[PDB]
């Protein structure tokens, strides 16, 4: 069994309405982890129990190099705690914001790891639904880690559909902005937006007003920098096709279609999951508590129904 007192609480890494993520050290081992702490009373009051349960189930039942892994889960009378592997490289959002744009080769590396993770999730009948820069982290070696599984839908195989209006506004697929149901191709739209951001340095569609933002997503044609390679233009046009049936990855073979795109001609998809490729960037931390790839906004801040939640990993 594991409790709150089994850990040192070092630094705030991230924060939302429904929880905080703290860098912790397990006292007995000296190992560092990221602990997500939620308030039961808030989760219950605001009807976030289903999302929290889904997040728990996905974490408990997935194992993939490019998905955040759960070490322990436990609870108290008023709190739920996920102890996850710590990604010391921060969010892809941090890095892209600093660099403005990635090379196509660097974008291809991250893109391949994301495709691998999405292929894996789809193979487990899970649709992720919230691909975005803030939910993609870099681990200590520079590999992608997908985070934030609360918006996943489980039990979606083949062309099964979903109804919930959810995601992140800027990343919503056009079909999600129509009435009725949508399928797993929404994840390839999401990949398209992040790939577009990585190679073009901006969102493909943006307005501060959601009504106008949603009009752009539904109605506006994407634009490309003149100098983007033809293969990059082709990939982005394919992933950001508005009709999910015409979208790259939208057909019956799903991730296969994306993997076979000429943009990824140089990728050995078997090497990808085995982590044989040297990543394009390794976080240059000087210690395990060096939080330089997290915003000072968080790290400076001082720190002072659920039946099947508890979990201890077999690793």
């Amino acid at each position: 069994k594991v409790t709150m007192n089994d850990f040192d609480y070092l630094k705030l890494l991230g924060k939302g309405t429904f929880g905080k993520v703290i860098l912790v050290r397990e006292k007995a081992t000296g190992r560092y982890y990221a602990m997500k702490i939620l308030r039961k009373e808030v989760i219950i009051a605001k009807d976030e129990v289903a999302h929290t349960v889904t997040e728990s189930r996905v974490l408990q039942n997935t194992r993939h190099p490019f998905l955040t892994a759960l070490k322990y889960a436990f609870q108290t009378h008023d709190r739920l705690c996920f102890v996850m592997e710590y990604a010391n490289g921060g969010e892809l959002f941090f890095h892209l914001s600093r660099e403005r744009v990635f090379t196509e080769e660097r974008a291809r590396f991250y893109g391949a790891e994301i495709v691998s993770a999405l292929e894996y999730l789809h193979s487990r009948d899970v649709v992720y639904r919230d691909i975005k820069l803030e939910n993609l982290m870099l681990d200590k070696d520079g590999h992608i880690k997908i985070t934030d599984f609360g918006l996943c839908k489980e039990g979606i195989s083949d062309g099964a559909t979903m109804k919930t209006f959810c995601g992140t506004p800027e990343y919503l697929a056009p079909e999600v902005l129509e009435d009725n149901d949508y399928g797993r191709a929404v994840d390839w739209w999401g990949l398209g937006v992040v790939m577009y951001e990585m190679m073009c340095g901006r969102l493909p569609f943006y307005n501060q007003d959601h009504e106008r933002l949603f009009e752009l997503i539904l109605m506006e044609e994407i634009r490309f920098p003149r100098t983007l390679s033809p293969e990059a233009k082709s990939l982005l046009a394919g992933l950001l096709k508005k009709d999910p049936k015409q979208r790259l990855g939208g057909g019956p073979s799903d991730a296969k279609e994306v993997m076979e795109h000429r943009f990824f001609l140089s990728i050995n998809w078997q090497d990808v999951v085995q982590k044989k490729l040297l990543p394009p960037f390794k976080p240059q931390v000087t210690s395990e508590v060096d939080t330089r790839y997290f915003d000072d906004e968080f790290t400076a801040q001082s720190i002072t129904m659920f039946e099947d939640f508890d979990y201890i990993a077999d690793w």
């Binding site: 999302h51 919230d130 975005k132 803030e134 609360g150 209006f165 992140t168 506004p169 969102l203």
Partner: peptide
């Protein structure tokens, strides 16, 4: 560097 975004569900 765009503003940070926020996930939602309705």
């Amino acid at each position: 560097g765009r503003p940070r975004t926020t996930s939602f569900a309705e």
